Design a protein around this ligand. Structure first.
Ligand SMILES: O=C(N[C@@H]1CCCS(=O)(=O)C1)c1ccc(Oc2ccc(C#C[C@]3(O)CN4CCC3CC4)cc2)cc1
Ligand SMILES: O=C(N[C@@H]1CCCS(=O)(=O)C1)c1ccc(Oc2ccc(C#C[C@]3(O)CN4CCC3CC4)cc2)cc1
Ligand SMILES: O=C(N[C@H]1CCCS(=O)(=O)C1)c1ccc(Oc2ccc(C#C[C@]3(O)CN4CCC3CC4)cc2)cc1
Ligand SMILES: O=C(N[C@H]1CCCS(=O)(=O)C1)c1ccc(Oc2ccc(C#C[C@]3(O)CN4CCC3CC4)cc2)cc1
Ligand SMILES: [Ca+2]
Ligand SMILES: [Ca+2]
Ligand SMILES: [Ca+2]
Ligand SMILES: [Ca+2]
Ligand SMILES: [Ca+2]
Ligand SMILES: [Ca+2]
Ligand SMILES: [Ca+2]
Ligand SMILES: [Ca+2]
Ligand code: NA
Ligand code: NA
Ligand code: NA
Ligand code: NA
Ligand SMILES: [Zn+2]
Ligand SMILES: [Zn+2]
Ligand SMILES: [Zn+2]
Ligand SMILES: [Zn+2]
Ligand SMILES: [Zn+2]
Ligand SMILES: [Zn+2]
Ligand SMILES: [Zn+2]
Ligand SMILES: [Zn+2]
Lengths: 166, 169, 166, 169
């Protein structure tokens, strides 16, 4: 027999990402910074490193889309589903899509992109939803106003359980 | 925290299905009996339970379509791809699609719907194709009609590696 | 230059149809009768004839589907959009899809299939929406209880303006 | 009663568009200037009006995507198909898609976004490809950058056969 085995973790520590397109809501510079900072969340506590490619295929393809946007898991217009990502693996594995029917922001007016991305990249790297209500991997969006992100211990233990400490 | 599970499987034992639409080739009643039996192939041999829904969102959405019918697996007219099913997962996950350019039956003629459905529902549950030529999960159609259907050992081991044996008696 | 020319009418009077699949809500016999009767509406007042095929390609392919069902014009779950059809032409032209997230009926409990089909086949044959509130080609569903359908004069004039009288 | 119109065209002169997302290759501002100019190619020469929407449902939804991006017209990486647009109609009708595996510019380098958009928007409005090698609707990319853009006669005749000339002065 055969089952469908999942890829439980990336078998390499060095990963690439490509920002394929850009939301109307934020500057390219703001978007870029949000994603760089969201990857940093995970690289800061593991041996994982993240390199941005401008062209061609990277492990983690990032794009913004609305409704049916190419994977038959359509988004839903404003609110509800915010974004989704695929777990580790080839092709669509690791990739992240953000519903551009949301208003994305570098602060408080709409969804904070850094925080939603950081959550999504947890998925990209092998983490499911946490049941701990303080966790970044908890299913619900929270934005504290705080200018300095610290990754909650539950997420640190989760990611470390896959990759070890940095 | 939670890491994703080891294999694609359902994380709950109680599953629902919906017959979204029906083939011209057989009565509603024959289609329903075929699919009920196909699920029982798997429930008999694990702790899985299957309940039919008449409408709304079920885990396993069953439908009959031809050519482009809403995914990346277009059908191809008569013979060829008979049907396909998505592995366990949300939305399209677990769904089962049957090519209605085939002849579906409850006999030895055309393609026996019970047998192809039993096969497809292994995919819906987490089994890919087997290489064991006696396996129900073998990717080639073979008709048998034994009064008491026995699931081949290779399929019993595959499915129980995913969900365990359920009540062994 | 080129525009995209529409096919304004079928260039043949004899047309075929295929019922590809069947709703859960009605017997095959009931469904069959509804479609036969809905075609009859248009054949009764024009030289058009309709032949049912069981297999292969016919001019008017009839199927029931939910959500995304193969043409990127998805249905919408219960209520709202009931069905849609394509105007005359090859391939998808003439075809009719019915949203099987509606309850279809031979009477009053849910949508009367005969009446919605008859409307859809008006589209299949080259008619747009009527502005006359009594017309079968008016955009809004009405079901009178009446056991005997008579096609409103506005629709008779519309279809005849394309094909002539029977 | 109403028979369908003779050609695929918009049955209203006031049309809206939405820039759903943006290419990495150019600033928001450059992208907006390119598209505004592309629409003005057609509004200058018919009674058509185009208004930008910042969100929601517009007649013409513009977006940048790669490979499978939600239709039956997957992109193909660099060169090849540059972009495609649906003819006038509801939902996908009028929408314009640009392959972001191309290099989009506001110069002679890569593919000039203004020119490819001007071309695509003819499709969004009801023009198919022309055989006139000097036509904007010719299916092959050619760069010119004349300060005052003149729409070629073949494209003026095509578009006005659909919507008339608007104010001729
Ligand atoms: O789409 C989403 N949710 C649902 C999916 C199904 C459809 S639905 O249920 O409507 C929405 C979705 C929701 C949230 C999300 O990203 C998330 C998830 C959790 C957080 C968080 C948090 C914090 O408490 C706030 N700070 C202190 C502790 C911790 C970290 C920083 C932020 C973004 C990403 C996606
Ligand atoms: O889907 C539909 N409508 C909308 C489309 C956009 C989404 S929405 O606006 O929610 C619904 C739709 C609606 C209706 C429909 O079929 C129709 C349309 C009109 C009729 C009618 C009628 C009658 O008045 C009743 N009798 C006496 C005169 C005449 C004929 C017999 C019946 C079915 C077919 C499709
Ligand atoms: O679509 C199908 N396969 C290919 C078609 C060609 C195009 S493709 O090559 O992509 C896939 C397809 C789909 C479903 C199928 O269902 C199947 C698969 C296997 C069987 C079987 C069998 C037995 O040998 C007969 N009995 C004794 C032992 C076992 C069990 C009972 C029956 C139906 C079989 C084939
Ligand atoms: O995708 C495209 N075409 C093919 C690519 C190969 C795959 S395919 O063969 O399917 C289609 C494609 C898409 C958009 C294009 O935009 C176009 C099309 C034509 C032009 C032009 C031109 C001129 O000659 C230059 N100037 C003087 C006269 C005219 C007008 C101004 C510019 C952009 C051009 C090509
Ligand atoms: Ca990937
Ligand atoms: Ca949303
Ligand atoms: Ca087939
Ligand atoms: Ca499912
Ligand atoms: Ca057809
Ligand atoms: Ca509906
Ligand atoms: Ca390309
Ligand atoms: Ca549109
Ligand atoms: Na947005
Ligand atoms: Na069939
Ligand atoms: Na139904
Ligand atoms: Na690009
Ligand atoms: Zn997606
Ligand atoms: Zn999540
Ligand atoms: Zn399918
Ligand atoms: Zn199979
Ligand atoms: Zn359809
Ligand atoms: Zn209608
Ligand atoms: Zn496209
Ligand atoms: Zn073109």
């Amino acid at each position: 027999y055969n089952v469908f085995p999942r890829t439980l973790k990336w078998s390499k520590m060095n990963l690439t990402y490509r920002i394929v397109n850009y939301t109307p809501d934020m500057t390219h510079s703001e978007v870029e910074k949000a994603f760089k900072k969201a990857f940093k969340v995970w690289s800061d506590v593991t041996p994982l490193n993240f390199t941005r490619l401008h062209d061609g295929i990277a492990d983690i393809m990032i794009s913004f889309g609305i409704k049916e946007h190419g994977d038959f898991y359509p988004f839903d217009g404003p609110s509800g589903l915010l974004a989704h990502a695929f777990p580790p693996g080839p092709n669509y594995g690791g990739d992240a899509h953000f519903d551009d029917d949301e208003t994305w922001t570098s602060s408080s007016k709409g969804y904070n992109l850094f925080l939603v991305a950081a959550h999504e990249f947890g998925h990209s790297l092998g983490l499911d939803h946490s049941k701990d209500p303080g966790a970044l991997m908890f299913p619900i969006y929270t934005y504290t106003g705080k200018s300095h992100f610290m990754l909650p211990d539950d997420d640190v233990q989760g990611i470390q359980s896959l990759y070890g400490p940095g």
